[PDB]
């Protein structure tokens, strides 16, 4: 239905081990499609999905040029931030940035994002109005004043409402056979005895895309939220994802427990029981 494009920038200093490394990756929803790595032998924006390969030389040149410039600016910014916090030259530090757009099923912009973190902590974020900034501390206020004078917010707003949405529309059309194909999970329930009186029921979902899914156990129609172990959704390596939910039941009470599965690729939501 709805979709998103996000770019993720990480800039990492490594004192005594060369200049800071700059890595950029681009995603459409849960699919990576480009990457740039400043340590590469020949640094350039490079394809990571088939449907982006068809883009012309001016595309890869623009994306590589912007990324090369970013490599130097982020090196400047790490030096600046180290100063804002009176930090020494010995430690390694990390700027992270995420930005992009969400579009609804009509392809209209739902909202844009731009936000930054320093060493894992929120630093500065563009507000939802795409016009003002939230600075996290007095260091970030300096960055905010720099960006107001540079009209950063106006450039990002123009990008987020223009190129971001347009190219996302174009990416969704060119990769429509994968990006707009929802693969349903393969499901089943397993039974692992723990003792004479209890056993583990585990509800499995495999091979689904996109990663968004709902896996829940019920006891007598009642949700077992507190008592369900949920593993983090993990990638299979072939674009699809996996997940499981597990609950420990009194032996002999198994059939009071149901696993419920909602996913966009499912015709109908699923209800599964342990089948001995």
């Amino acid at each position: 239905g709805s979709h998103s494009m996000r770019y993720f920038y990480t800039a990492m200093s490594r004192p005594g081990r060369g200049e800071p490394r700059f890595i950029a990756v681009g995603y459409v929803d849960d699919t990576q499609f480009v990457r740039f790595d400043s340590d590469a032998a020949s640094p350039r924006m490079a394809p990571r999905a088939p449907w982006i390969e068809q883009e012309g030389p001016e595309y890869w040149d623009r994306n590589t040029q912007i990324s090369k410039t970013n490599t130097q600016t982020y090196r400047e910014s790490l030096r600046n931030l180290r100063g804002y916090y009176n930090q020494s030259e010995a430690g390694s530090h990390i700027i992270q940035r995420m930005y992009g757009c969400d579009v609804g099923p009509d392809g209209r912009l739902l909202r844009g994002y731009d936000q930054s973190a320093y060493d894992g902590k929120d630093y500065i974020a563009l507000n939802e109005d795409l016009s003002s900034w939230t600075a996290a501390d007095t260091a970030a206020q300096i960055t905010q004043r720099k960006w107001e004078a540079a009209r950063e917010a106006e450039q990002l707003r123009a990008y987020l409402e223009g190129l971001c949405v347009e190219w996302l529309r174009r990416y969704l059309e060119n990769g429509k056979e994968t990006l707009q194909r929802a693969d349903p999970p393969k499901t089943h329930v397993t039974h692992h005895p723990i003792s004479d009186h209890e056993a583990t029921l585990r509800c499995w979902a495999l091979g689904f895309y996109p990663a968004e899914i709902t896996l829940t156990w019920q006891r007598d129609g009642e949700d077992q939220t507190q008592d369900t172990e949920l593993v983090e959704t993990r990638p299979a390596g072939d674009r699809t994802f996996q997940k499981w939910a597990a609950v420990v039941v009194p032996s002999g009470e198994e059939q009071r427990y149901t696993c419920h599965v909602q996913h966009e690729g499912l015709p109908k939501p699923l209800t599964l029981r342990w089948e001995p």
Binding site: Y7, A24, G26, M45, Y59, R62, N63, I66, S67, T69, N70, T73, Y74, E76, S77, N80, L81, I95, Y99, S116, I124, T143, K146, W147, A150, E152, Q155, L156, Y159, L163, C164, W167
Partner: peptide, 9 residues
């Protein structure tokens, strides 16, 4: 496609 290079922090 990437946004244009932004200003330094």
């Amino acid at each position: 496609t990437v946004a244009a290079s932004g200003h330094s922090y």
